[PDB]
């Protein structure tokens, strides 16, 4: 006769990970590669050299 | 050859008027003309001499 682990199972401490198992996030390849501008109007204008 | 206004059209500044064009506004002729009471009840009862 002895205190098995099952006999004391209800006394054992518990632990949950403090973080989630997930992939590291990529972000947009477009936002990573191409330079961007802050817009204030919804339809910005863009002069382009022609000649 | 020279830079025409059509060639520089994309570079031209814009201006927008600082305020909206609108007619003048006015309040009800009824509230201007007639006496009014504060109602506290949703109905007021009024006694009228009948005969």
């Amino acid at each position: 006769a002895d205190i098995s682990r099952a006999d004391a199972l209800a006394l054992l401490a518990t632990q949950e990970l403090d973080s989630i198992i997930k992939p590291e996030t990529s972000g947009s390849a477009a936002l990573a590669a191409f330079r961007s501008i802050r817009m204030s109007a919804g339809t910005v204008s863009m002069p382009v050299l022609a000649a």
Side-chain angles (χ1 to χ4, degrees), chain A residues 26-44:
Chain A
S26 306
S28 160
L31 296 172
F34 318 133
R35 177 181 55 76
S36 84
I37 52 86
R38 301 310 304 210
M39 307 172 78
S40 300
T43 299
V44 159

Side-chain angles (χ1 to χ4, degrees), chain A residues 5-38:
Chain A
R5 193 175 173 90
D7 291 330
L9 174 55
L11 306 184
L12 306 181
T14 70
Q15 194 193 337
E16 306 80 0
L17 273 177
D18 62 349
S19 62
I20 293 179
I21 306 301
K22 56 180 161 67
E24 76 300 334
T25 49
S26 306
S28 160
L31 296 172
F34 318 133
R35 177 181 55 76
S36 84
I37 52 86
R38 301 310 304 210

